[PDB]
Amino acid sequence: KKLLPIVANLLKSLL
């Protein structure tokens, strides 16, 4: 539900 290309950015790094 959206917010997927953000929380995921902080999790790992660039990707």
Q: How far is CA 4 from CA 10, 13, 15, in A?
A: 11, 14, 11
Non-local CB neighbours of 8 within 8 Å, separated by 6+ positions = 15
- Using H for helix, E for strand and C for coil, what is the string for the chain? CCCHHHHHHHHCCCC
CB atoms closer than 10 angstroms to residue 14: 4
CA 9 to chain centre: 3
| Sign of the dihedral through C-alpha 2, 13, 10, 12 | positive
How far separated are the first and last CA of the chain, in Å rounded?
Answer: 18
Q: How far is CA 13 from CA 8, 9, in A?
A: 8, 6
Query: Which residue is it, tokens 């290309």?
Result: 5
Q: How was this structure determined?
A: NMR
Q: What angle do CA 11, 4, 13 make, to 5 degrees?
A: 25
